[PDB]
Amino acid sequence: MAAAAVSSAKRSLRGELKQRLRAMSAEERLRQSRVLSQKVIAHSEYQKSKRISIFLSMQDEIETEEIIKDIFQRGKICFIPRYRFQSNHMDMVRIESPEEISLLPKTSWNIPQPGEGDVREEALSTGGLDLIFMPGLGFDKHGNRLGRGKGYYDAYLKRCLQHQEVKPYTLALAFKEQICLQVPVNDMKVDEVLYE
Ligand SMILES: N[C@@H]1N[C@@H]2NC[C@@H](CN(C=O)c3ccc(C(=O)N[C@H](CCC(=O)O)C(=O)O)cc3)N[C@H]2[C@H](O)N1
Ligand SMILES: [Mg+2]
Ligand SMILES: [Mg+2]
Ligand SMILES: [Mg+2]
Ligand SMILES: [Mg+2]
Ligand SMILES: [Mg+2]
Ligand SMILES: [Mg+2]
Ligand SMILES: [Mg+2]
Ligand SMILES: [Mg+2]
Ligand SMILES: [Mg+2]
Ligand code: NI
Ligand code: NI
Secondary structure, eight states: OHHHHHHHHHHHHHHHHHHHHHTSOHHHHHHHHHHHHHHHHTOHHHHHOSEEEOOOOOTTSOOOHHHHHHHHHTTOEEEEEEEETTTTEEEEEEEOOHHHHTTSOBOTTSOBOOOTTOOOOBGGGTTOOSEEEEOOSEEOTTOOEEOSSSOHHHHHHHHHTTTOSSOOEEEEEOOGGGBOSOOOOOOOOOSEEEOO
16 A cells, blocks of 8 residues: 555656646757756766766657767767567667667657667676666656656666676756656665756
């Protein structure tokens, strides 16, 4: 019953956040994304990190396009999500240029990812990750995160520990509209939430 009340609070907050995210203009989402891109590019954990996981942005997320271009300009090794919907499991798989992204097939969320038989280097098979850009629907200032529901990033963070001594730094990228007083939890916290 306590579990269910937690789920109910998460669901209600998701509906609130989604409505705000729906209510934002394309131009404005683009403005806050530009502000975050400059913040990330100046960020010391980003500047020092060699192996990075970043997401490919949905319409309700901070746009990561400029960060990706910077990643490859700085010769960082870049991994993106590859989600297997049948088992609710995600890996982070290597891409070798920003331009490759444009040729990939897309999922039912209209996001690019390498297809089923494209054999890819996985981040945990070749060293793990220094830094993971964390998407999500909401975050509070304690670093709690409200994801879309099925906990694929929480599960992936747990998995990272099985390959690395040092846990990846987790940096969320949020609209100011996505910052909440308290995210209902219980769930993995992020190290830092960036917003305007
Ligand atoms: N740009 C990135 N790409 C990432 N790629 C992997 C991915 C998985 N994903 C798709 O790639 C995905 C989306 C929703 C649910 C789930 O948790 N949600 C529905 C309710 C959400 C809907 O009604 O709006 C349900 O609980 O199943 C699980 C996996 N999540 C993406 C992430 O959220 N944003
Ligand atoms: Mg809604
Ligand atoms: Mg409200
Ligand atoms: Mg402007
Ligand atoms: Mg959406
Ligand atoms: Mg360097
Ligand atoms: Mg699949
Ligand atoms: Mg992996
Ligand atoms: Mg699909
Ligand atoms: Mg996993
Ligand atoms: Ni897998
Ligand atoms: Ni608090």
